């Protein structure tokens, strides 16, 4: 249902409207450069060097009987060297020969082939490829030997116990020189710090190095001989790729950093608040360094902002560090093991900036186009304003062009009951000119007083005025009332079509674009959970459950 029949009037007073002339453009972020440098948490255990001392006592049972010899007993007695004579094994590498042993007041002496109380030399033995370096001193009967061994060791993070590469575990901190409350659980009196006496590393025997201090703990069987250090040699932080050309952005809640080479983008929690380190004191030397250098090679483009190197902490746990630039004229952290969370953020950030600038314009180009559309809407009003004011407003209105403003009014409806039409376009005075439009007759609402007037375009009727043209030869033309058309051949209602199925013109530029369809993602995987367990060359769960199957035969019967 469209707008119905109506009649308009009142050129005098309505409301007032004026065409605008100065429509502006109501259009719709800052960023600093930087030199960031990021650290991750450390997992590598701490290491050092070590050297062990031991001395063997053997008891091998040889039997000389009647039928056959009985090669039976194999006895190991590794014995520990006292403190006051180890040093000769290090200086010119000479080894003591006899064993001196006391037991419960008694004293026993076991010489080695009527041995001497004076020392003997040694010789390096064979060994495995990149294995353990070890030197020996020999090339029920009794024989003995000394042994020295050189190897590596490693310990875990919160300093409970350190374990060598062979299995001689011993519960003590590697940083304990007395009078320092660290973790320590050995019994008593097994410590010595003989201050600055040197060890020579078997290439020569005469050179004198600095020779920092050394501890001499023995359990009772084997003497460990590492060298101690102060407890700033294990920083709990480690290095990573340092970028060069980042750019920062502060919006709303927190900051975003965006690099461009490693195409990542980190994100932090607080807003400005510079956290300061507490026990990360080792790493400040490396970062007071090497910020320069990266400052140095871009000297002709930027200046410093301030000396204050600031720190941050991100969500997954990676402490940052960076200093701002400007253009010029002329405990622990415990990070979470994954990539692809500092990676995905690029795919959502660097797609945001591209789409937003594309929608940056076309808000500009749409505005500039509408200024030119406004001007065309002025000159149409000077032709016939009663048509063009209707479509812009929304309903059937009327106006009558007073001066340089528009004269909006309100029309009165007419009853839908009885409409008429005239059967002849001829003026009923003579054989002269004719009307051009089919004048009709009508009546008001609820009063039944009938009038007549002229039907105009778009089923609007104004009264008390005619219009005509000169009659001529035969040329038909159509008209269009409510929901139908009907043809005049020359001056008669010759036909009535009553179908609005005559072909239209179809002027509509179809912006026929698309939607965005929703594909789903599969779940692929590069290295299965089962496959990781078979990666080790040893079968730890195969050895032990086989060893206690042929060793339950001690209970024979």
């Amino acid at each position: 249902t469209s707008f119905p029949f109506r009649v308009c009037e009142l050129s005098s007073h309505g409301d007032l409207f004026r065409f605008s002339s100065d429509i502006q453009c109501p259009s719709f972020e800052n960023h600093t450069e930087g030199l960031l440098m990021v650290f991750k948490d450390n997992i590598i255990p701490y290491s050092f060097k070590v050297r062990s001392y031991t001395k063997i006592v053997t008891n091998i049972l040889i039997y000389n009987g009647h039928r056959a010899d009985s090669v039976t007993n194999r006895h190991e007695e590794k014995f520990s060297v006292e403190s006051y004579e180890t040093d000769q094994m290090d200086t010119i590498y000479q080894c003591y020969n006899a064993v001196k042993m006391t037991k419960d007041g008694l004293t026993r002496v076991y010489v080695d082939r009527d041995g001497v109380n004076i020392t003997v030399n040694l010789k390096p033995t064979g060994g495995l490829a990149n294995g353990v370096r070890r030197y020996a001193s020999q090339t029920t009967r009794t024989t003995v030997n000394c042994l020295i061994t050189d190897m590596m060791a490693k310990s875990n993070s919160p300093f409970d116990f350190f374990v060598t590469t062979t299995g001689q575990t011993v519960e003590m901190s590697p940083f304990y020189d007395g009078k320092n409350t660290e973790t320590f659980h050995e019994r008593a009196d097994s410590f010595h710090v003989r201050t600055n006496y040197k060890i020579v590393d078997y290439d020569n025997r005469g050179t004198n190095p600095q020779g920092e201090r050394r501890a001499f703990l023995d359990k009772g069987t084997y003497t460990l001989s590492w060298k101690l250090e102060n407890r700033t040699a294990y920083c709990p932080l480690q290095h990573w790729q340092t970028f060069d050309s980042t750019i920062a952005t502060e919006t709303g809640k927190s900051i975003h950093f965006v690099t461009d080479e490693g195409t990542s983008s980190f994100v932090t929690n607080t807003t400005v608040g510079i956290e300061l380190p507490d026990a990360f004191k080792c790493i400040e030397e490396q970062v007071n360094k090497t910020m320069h250098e990266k400052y140095e090679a871009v000297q002709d483009r930027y200046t410093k902002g301030q000396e204050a190197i600031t720190y941050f902490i991100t969500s997954g746990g990676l402490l940052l560090a960076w200093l701002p630039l400007t253009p010029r004229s002329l405990k622990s952290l415990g990070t979470l093991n994954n990539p692809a969370t500092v990676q995905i953020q690029f795919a959502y950030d660097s797609l945001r900036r591209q789409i937003n600038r594309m929608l940056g314009d076309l808000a500009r180009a749409w505005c500039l186009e509408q200024k030119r559309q406004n001007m065309v809407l002025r000159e149409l009003t000077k032709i016939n304003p009663t048509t063009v004011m209707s479509s812009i407003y929304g309903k059937a209105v009327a106006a009558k062009r007073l001066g340089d403003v528009i004269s909006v009014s309100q029309c009165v409806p007419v009853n839908q009951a009885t409409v008429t039409l005239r059967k002849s376009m001829r003026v009923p005075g003579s054989e002269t000119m004719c009307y051009s439009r089919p004048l009709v007759s009508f009546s008001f609402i609820n009063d039944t007083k009938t009038y007549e007037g002229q039907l105009g375009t778009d089923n609007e009727i104004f009264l008390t005025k005619k219009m005509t043209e000169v009659c001529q030869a035969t040329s038909q033309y159509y008209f269009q009332s409510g929901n139908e058309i009907h043809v005049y051949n020359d001056y008669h209602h010759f036909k009535t079509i009553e179908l609005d199925g005559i072909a239209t013109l179809q002027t509509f530029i179809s912006l026929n674009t698309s939607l965005i369809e929703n594909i789903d993602f599969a779940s692929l995987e590069l290295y299965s959970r089962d496959e990781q367990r078979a990666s080790n060359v040893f079968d730890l769960e195969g050895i032990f459950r086989e060893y206690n199957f042929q060793a339950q035969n001690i209970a024979g019967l």
């Epitope: 009951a417 009885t418 008429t420 059967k423 009546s443 039944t448 007083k449 009938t450 043809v487 051949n489 008669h492 209602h493 010759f494 036909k495 009535t496």
Partner: antibody, heavy 119, light 110 residues
Framework: QSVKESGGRLVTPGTPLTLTCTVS????????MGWVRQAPGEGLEWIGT?????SSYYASWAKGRFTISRTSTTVDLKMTSLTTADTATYFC????????????????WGPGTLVTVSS | ALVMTQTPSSVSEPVGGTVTIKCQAS??????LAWYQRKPGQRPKLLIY???TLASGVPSRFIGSGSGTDYTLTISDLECDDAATYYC????????????FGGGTKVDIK
């Protein structure tokens, strides 16, 4: 001139019956026809008549029933679905100006044939 | 829509008598219409339409006029065997109505 008629026949209820208005010696185009009925005991009636070039209009009683058409030689109303008490006489009329003015009584038409449905 | 009405049709007047019969209109068509005249057993006859336009072969006694919303027929001293039946119609408003007439009347002899 005048016209003669045909199609009058007794019938049972439930049957569509047509007619034919036989024209005689005048313009097929430059006039408009007409139809009126009257059973003895009442007066003149509805129909409302043909347009000169094509589709026409009529009264509001039997909208959807009568499918009156036209060829270049005759005119005819089609009575498809009917009732029973209507037993009257049809007349192929002829108007002059606007829907029967100048033929206000009517100008020239025929004596008509009586149709009647009755068991 | 428009609706046609009419005075009571009972009239009893002899030769030398007349007719006083009119029909009325509800909504004003501004009176463009005619009457109806027909011998029983015969086709209706053409007569004067449009209140001033006498047709061919019309009788001189049959005169009736008016204006506004209605006309009136009034024919003095009719002869014997004429005694026709009559009604009107509504002219210039041919549509969206259920009826084109509204009744009928008859004149007889005494």
């Amino acid at each position: 001139q005048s016209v003669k008629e045909s199609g009058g026949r007794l019938v049972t209820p439930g049957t569509p019956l047509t007619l034919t208005c036989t024209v005689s010696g005048f313009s097929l185009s430059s006039y408009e026809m007409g139809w009126v009925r009257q059973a003895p005991g009442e007066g003149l009636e509805w129909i409302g008549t043909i347009s000169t070039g094509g589709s026409s209009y009529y009264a509001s009683w039997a909208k959807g029933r009568f499918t009156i058409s036209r060829t270049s030689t005759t005119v005819d109303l089609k009575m498809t679905s009917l009732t029973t008490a209507d037993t009257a006489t049809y007349f192929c009329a002829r108007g002059y100006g606007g829907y029967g003015i100048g033929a206000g009584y009517f100008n020239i038409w025929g004596p008509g044939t009586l149709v009647t449905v009755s068991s | 829509a428009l609706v046609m009405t009419q005075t009571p049709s009972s009239v009893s007047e002899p030769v030398g008598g007349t007719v006083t019969i009119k029909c009325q209109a509800s909504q004003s068509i501004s009176s463009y219409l005619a009457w109806y005249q027909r011998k029983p057993g015969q086709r209706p006859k053409l007569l004067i339409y449009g209140t001033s336009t006498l047709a061919s072969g019309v009788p001189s006694r049959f005169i009736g006029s008016g204006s506004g919303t209605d006309y009136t027929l009034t024919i003095s001293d009719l002869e014997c065997d004429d005694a026709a039946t009559y009604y009107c119609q509504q002219g210039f408003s041919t549509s969206n109505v259920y009826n084109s007439f509204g009744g009928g009347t008859k004149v007889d002899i005494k």
